[PDB]
Design a protein around this nucleic acid. Structure first.
Length: 50
DNA sequence: ATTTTACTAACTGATAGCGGAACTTTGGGACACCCACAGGTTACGCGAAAATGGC
């Protein structure tokens, strides 16, 4: 399985019309909710809980 | 004279009905005081079409 912790990933420039490689960080625990920090194609940082 | 058969009456079993008591079944009640919930979740991805938002 995927180890608990924090993982930094990217969409590899395959979501938005241009390249604009979008970066995200996911905190995944053993038990509990998930935390997501993502960049939008406007260079703003957004948070998602679960 | 004897043997086979048709007729009849009695026995017996099935069955519908009833009695009645036990058994299952339904509805009501309980007066210290108690006063807003979960409840797991998700590492999908893609294309369309439908609903929102921007000025």
């Amino acid at each position: 399985h995927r180890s608990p912790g924090v993982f930094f990933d990217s969409d590899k420039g395959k979501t938005h019309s241009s390249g604009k490689v979008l970066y995200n960080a996911r905190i995944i625990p053993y038990r509990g909710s998930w935390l997501d920090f993502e960049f939008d194609p406007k260079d703003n940082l957004y948070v998602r809980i679960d």
